[PDB]
Design a protein around this ligand. Structure first.
Ligand SMILES: O=C(CS)N1c2ccccc2CCc2ccccc21
Ligand SMILES: O=C(CS)N1c2ccccc2CCc2ccccc21
Lengths: 300, 300
């Protein structure tokens, strides 16, 4: 038993991290088959980032201006192209450590593991969630750009995230592996509004089920509620509205614990209206929303 | 910026995980050079675990009773011996993926990453702390025994923990890689007292420094205190006593933030006597003690 915020084993992704240098800018890239993926602002200086014309800046670059280094060995760049906000560097050799992989664009509320890297070397791994406003609350120092987020299904790595920038508010923004940003953001050093964030209601409920499975039951109440009554409380407390799709995804957890989804919703409503009174759930003094229903089933 | 509970990249350890089966019991083992390390209770049935005589049970076993499988390939066992609570199976081949490594016995309050495994396959990685009472609050299902904890220094893996059992209280206990248990525990299915746990004071302080570095400063107070006055408050709230060794280890963080250690202690004292009033520090509604001063410096 016990419950931890677990990340996926990162070995398959560590074998794909390289260092990409263009001019005096260096960041991380993802080497899969004979292509290296990295943020396109690798071609920018700090002054460029105030208002960059990426097409004009890329046109000044040739294949030999991109230094791609995997461990101690150098890769030969035989082609380069821009796809949305990522650079795709065609190299002469296929990464012998390429895992089976897919590129996927996740939805808000879904979770993934981040391998934080610097100069192409991994430093740590952690599990996080795509916020409903399409930011992530990561740990990204300078030079961490190009670090990637992923999920693993047995032997297949689904890459879903590449880190591009930190907003003035301290949260982080990035793209899928086709270079399309999650959210309204652009790769330019200008003030950019993230929307109102909300709590991922279905994730909180999944984690309340994880708590019951692990013995924390003090929050179980004698009440029930309706989907519409609960969503009234949800909107007040800036929780995402619960849908019947969310009720269905929680089904297996409902079956395992013997607690109806709407009964668990009534417990959550009581927790939102009355707080926790200094008590804890699974060692947390607040409601956790970084576990999906799939995460809870996988761990439990 | 940002701050996450990061685990070490686990790839070097994933290459060392094998499946060990003895009779009908299967768990995880650690394959380094030509030796496989695993918990000795792999030779026990559930009924054996009530009161096992390991020497007598091991004597009934021969080299060919140990099935060691690394991925799809089988290892040939050419020797077996018991060192305290671990089994050491000498196999005919050196693990070609053996990283540079050391065996270390950590101290309470220190942290490490756990690669949770089942049937020799990794499922997740997470960062945790050795509690002052020598338990760990992990996530370990049946068959997770033999999963290991570790730290990584550049290219060197310091193995410090092997999981052996879950106590009736739901916390977990294990050994170093020489087979000596952390704590008073024994590998037998009997009720065993973990002592009073305490909060790792030096870790809380390190994480308060991480908070200041990341912009959370509301808890900074106009007070200071003394080491002895603070320890008076520490004992009341079941915090470990702060020593001058702890003050020295916090030095670099004190220098970076410009906040004296004893001033930070005064802020912590105020937090212990008055609570957080529903506010948060680095997204947590309680005081975190799973980051060492070294962890904070490494991340920041
Ligand atoms: O985040 C990173 C690097 S990881 N960069 C970004 C990204 C977005 C907005 C601004 C900046 C300023 C710093 C800078 C300079 C040169 C190349 C990239 C970056
Ligand atoms: O924890 C595990 C397996 S991971 N086991 C332990 C350990 C300590 C006390 C009791 C038990 C009971 C279950 C059992 C049965 C057979 C071999 C080992 C174990």
């Amino acid at each position: 038993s016990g419950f931890r915020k677990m990340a996926f084993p990162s070995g398959k992704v560590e074998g794909c991290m390289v260092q990409v240098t263009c001019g005096t800018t260096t960041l991380n890239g993802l080497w899969l088959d004979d292509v290296v993926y990295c943020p396109r602002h690798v071609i920018c200086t700090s002054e460029d980032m105030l208002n960059p014309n990426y097409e004009d800046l890329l046109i000044r670059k040739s294949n030999h201006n991109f230094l791609v280094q995997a461990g101690n060995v150098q890769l030969r760049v035989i082609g380069h192209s821009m796809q949305n906000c990522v650079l795709k560097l065609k190299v002469d050799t296929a990464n012998p450590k390429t895992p089976k992989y897919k590129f996927v664009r996740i939805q808000p509320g879904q979770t993934f593991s981040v391998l934080a890297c610097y100069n192409g070397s991994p430093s740590g791994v952690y599990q996080c969630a795509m916020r409903p406003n399409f930011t992530i609350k990561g740990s990204f120092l300078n030079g961490s750009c190009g670090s990637v987020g992923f999920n693993i299904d047995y032997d297949c790595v689904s890459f879903c995230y590449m880190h591009h920038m930190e907003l003035p508010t301290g949260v982080h923004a990035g793209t899928d592996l086709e270079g399309n940003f999650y959210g309204p953001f652009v790769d330019r050093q200008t003030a950019q509004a993230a929307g109102t964030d909300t709590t991922i209601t279905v994730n909180v409920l999944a984690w309340l089920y994880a708590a019951v499975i692990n013995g924390d039951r003090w929050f179980l109440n004698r009440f029930t509620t309706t989907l519409n009554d609960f969503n009234l409380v949800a909107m007040k407390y800036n929780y995402e509205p619960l849908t019947q799709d969310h009720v269905d995804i929680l089904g297996p957890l409902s079956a395992q614990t013997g607690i109806a989804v709407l009964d668990m919703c009534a417990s959550l409503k009581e927790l939102l209206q009355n707080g926790m009174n200094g008590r804890t759930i699974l060692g947390s003094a607040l409601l956790e929303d970084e576990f999906t229903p799939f995460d809870v089933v996988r761990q439990c």
